[PDB]
Design an enzyme around this catalytic site. Sequence first.
Site, short mmCIF file in Angstrom:
data_model
loop_
_atom_site.label_atom_id
_atom_site.label_comp_id
_atom_site.label_asym_id
_atom_site.label_seq_id
_atom_site.Cartn_x
_atom_site.Cartn_y
_atom_site.Cartn_z
N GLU A 92 0.79 -1.24 0.00
CA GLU A 92 0.00 0.00 0.00
C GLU A 92 0.82 1.29 0.00
OE1 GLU A 92 -3.08 -0.03 -0.39
OE2 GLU A 92 -3.86 -2.04 0.18
N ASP A 144 -6.58 6.49 -4.58
CA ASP A 144 -6.10 5.16 -4.77
C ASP A 144 -6.07 4.76 -6.27
OD1 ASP A 144 -8.66 4.31 -5.32
OD2 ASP A 144 -8.86 3.06 -3.53
N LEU A 202 -8.96 3.76 3.12
CA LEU A 202 -9.98 4.42 2.29
C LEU A 202 -10.83 5.43 3.08
CD1 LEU A 202 -11.67 4.67 -0.42
CD2 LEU A 202 -13.30 3.19 0.67
N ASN A 250 -6.85 -19.74 -11.23
CA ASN A 250 -8.18 -19.19 -11.15
C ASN A 250 -8.25 -17.72 -10.68
OD1 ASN A 250 -11.23 -19.38 -9.69
ND2 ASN A 250 -10.83 -20.31 -11.72
#
Length: 162
Positions: free
Chosen positions: A11, A20, A32, A132
């Site tokens: 981050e 962001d 956030l 996946n």
Amino acid sequence: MNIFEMLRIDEGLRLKIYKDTEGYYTIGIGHLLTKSPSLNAAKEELDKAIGRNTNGVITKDEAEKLFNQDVDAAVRGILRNAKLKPVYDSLDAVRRAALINMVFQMGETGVAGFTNSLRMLQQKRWDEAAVNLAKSRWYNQTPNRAKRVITTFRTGTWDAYK
Ligand SMILES: [Cl-]
């Protein structure tokens, strides 16, 4: 390496309000603030979060306090969630950090949506899970970070962060 060090690498640390990768106002270590496009609405949330009138700038200690709270929230979110908890319980310490990372980034509800991949992880089908996970919007929007997380799941080591 541990979860705090890992997320600090993913981050970064910013002491002034920033946007962001999705354009949302954030501060500190990926905290956030709001999805509103109003910078003033962001500033307001920031003041409420910190308990002081900030004008958009915080100290390192204040960023670290928000970070401690956010990591604790991610972990409690995992432990509370019917889909996530059993996965967490099945994993080793390193892979547990990787799941925390995803929850920190996407939220409890978002990660719980990766049904198929979660099952693969619980079954310890590392390579299949990795393949996946890479089909997601998550991977396509933030590929460098997602690759680091996926590699951690694949190997169970901190090599992608070394
Ligand atoms: Cl908060």
